[PDB]
């Protein structure tokens, strides 16, 4: 299973680096070893990175997060986003935070303030594991990847 879940709504659109297409994460549950876009925090550049496994974490409460440019995602309270002061849980974010977005359309990260965080409802939620960089782009937002438990029990 997962050591810890940072799950997001199944409707979240995952940018697939190989094909340049976006696919809802719920539709990736039976897929593995495909490439996503992830931030390398050491270089602040986006890199292609391989997903090892997709997980369905069950029904959970989700919250809609919105940034100024209009980026939006539905995620659990435990999903993590990258702020100027490091990774934070969705339920730790406030309107004073900026979150990291991949640049769209010089740097690779654009920092955008949060304008809304709202409880939305209960949905099936999903996680990706991304060994190494441990993050991926969903709905054009950087989100942290979950951590799989060691096969022996971890």
Numbering used by the authors: -6 to -1, 1 to 99, 115 to 163
Q: What did the published study say regarding this structure?
A:
Inteins are protein elements that remove themselves from their precursor proteins in an autocatalytic pathway called protein splicing. In the first step of the canonical class 1 inteins, the scissile peptide bond upstream of the intein rearranges in an N–S (or N–O) acyl shift involving the cysteine (or serine) side chain as the first amino acid of the intein (residue 1) and the upstream flanking amino acid of the N-extein (residue (–1)). The M86 mutant of the Ssp DnaB intein (here referred to as WT intein) was selected by sequential directed evolution for its more general activity and is one of the few known intein mutants with improved extein promiscuity.
